[PDB]
Design an enzyme around this catalytic site. Structure first.
Site, short mmCIF file in Angstrom:
data_model
loop_
_atom_site.label_atom_id
_atom_site.label_comp_id
_atom_site.label_asym_id
_atom_site.label_seq_id
_atom_site.Cartn_x
_atom_site.Cartn_y
_atom_site.Cartn_z
N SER A 95 -7.79 11.13 -5.05
CA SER A 95 -8.14 11.64 -3.71
C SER A 95 -7.80 13.09 -3.47
CB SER A 95 -7.47 10.81 -2.61
OG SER A 95 -8.05 9.53 -2.62
N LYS A 113 -10.71 15.17 -2.36
CA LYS A 113 -11.23 15.19 -0.99
C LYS A 113 -11.11 16.55 -0.36
CE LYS A 113 -10.72 10.25 -0.54
NZ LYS A 113 -9.79 9.13 -0.39
N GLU A 118 -16.55 7.45 -4.46
CA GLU A 118 -15.51 6.46 -4.28
C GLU A 118 -16.07 5.05 -4.38
OE1 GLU A 118 -12.42 7.05 -4.08
OE2 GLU A 118 -12.18 9.04 -3.22
N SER A 147 -4.08 8.88 -5.46
CA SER A 147 -3.55 7.80 -6.27
C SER A 147 -4.71 7.08 -6.90
CB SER A 147 -2.67 6.86 -5.44
OG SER A 147 -3.45 6.12 -4.54
#
EC number: 3.5.2.6
Length: 261
Positions: free
Chosen positions: A43, A46, A139, A210
């Site tokens: 992540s 992002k 994702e 993670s």
């Protein structure tokens, strides 16, 4: 240096592979540990998607207020904010905030779609001079973190330089940069990672990540009181697919770095 010996010892104690890059903007000095090795971003990617959307908003001035429908089919594995708006809309600003501050995976996928796919996120990285970042998947599959797989990876050095440019530099317009900084400072997922190794008085903006293989990441901009800011990237991954997260390793790495400044 002492710091590299201590980071190597931390790594040895942890059983995994640690990557660290620190930029001290006071003198533009860098501290690197496995700085040019690839790590799965999970992540932490992002940040690049949100910043690409912010860059689009420099020309499309109203873009962040554009409503985007959240449908049941959009939900993936971790959607703390999007879940609250199923069969409703969220603006691109709200999706960006959700992706960054709660690590919402549906929100990330909507940002990727707005950019025309993962290739559009990668293109933004290239446009601001990051030749290392690559986003290949959406994702949740971008978190598979398979050893050796170059998909959805970057290096600590590259990510530190990019994060510096996005937050402290001028890769974004002034309003957009300030918004990104505000979003990072309001992150809710970082308390046990870089922030836990730093003096409580310092201001931190960060994004965690993670993934599988116990991948445990955090990227941060750090504003110490009375002192130039720092950019710190800490990536960590482990040899067992089902390894547990090790946020404490990131806290310890930050603490080691903070000793000596």
């Amino acid at each position: 240096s002492a710091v590299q010996q201590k980071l190597a010892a931390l790594e040895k104690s942890s059983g995994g592979r640690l990557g660290v890059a620190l930029i001290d903007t006071a003198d533009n000095t860098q501290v690197l540990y496995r700085g040019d090795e690839r790590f799965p971003m999970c992540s932490t990617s992002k940040v690049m998607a949100a910043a690409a959307v912010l860059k689009q908003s420099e020309t499309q001035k109203q873009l962040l207020n554009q409503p985007v429908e959240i449908k049941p089919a959009d939900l993936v594995n971790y959607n703390p904010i999007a879940e609250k708006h199923v069969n409703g809309t969220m603006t691109l600003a709200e999706l960006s905030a959700a992706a960054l501050q709660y690590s919402d995976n549906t929100a990330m996928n909507k940002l990727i779609a707005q950019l025309g796919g993962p290739g559009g996120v990668t293109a933004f990285a290239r446009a601001i001079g990051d030749e290392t970042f690559r986003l290949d998947r959406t994702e949740p599959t971008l978190n598979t973190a398979i050893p050796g797989d170059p998909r959805d990876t970057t290096t600590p050095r590259a990510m530190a330089q990019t994060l510096r440019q996005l937050t402290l530099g001028h890769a974004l317009g002034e309003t957009q940069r300030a918004q990104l900084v505000t979003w990072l400072k309001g992150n809710t997922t970082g308390a046990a990672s870089i922030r836990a190794g730093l003096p409580t008085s310092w201001t931190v903006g960060d994004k965690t990540g993670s993934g599988d293989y116990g991948t445990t990441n955090d990227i941060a901009v750090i504003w110490p009181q009375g002192r130039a800011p720092l950019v710190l990237v800490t990536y960590f991954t482990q040899p067992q697919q089902n390894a547990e997260s090790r946020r404490d390793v990131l806290a310890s790495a930050a603490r080691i770095i903070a000793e000596g400044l």
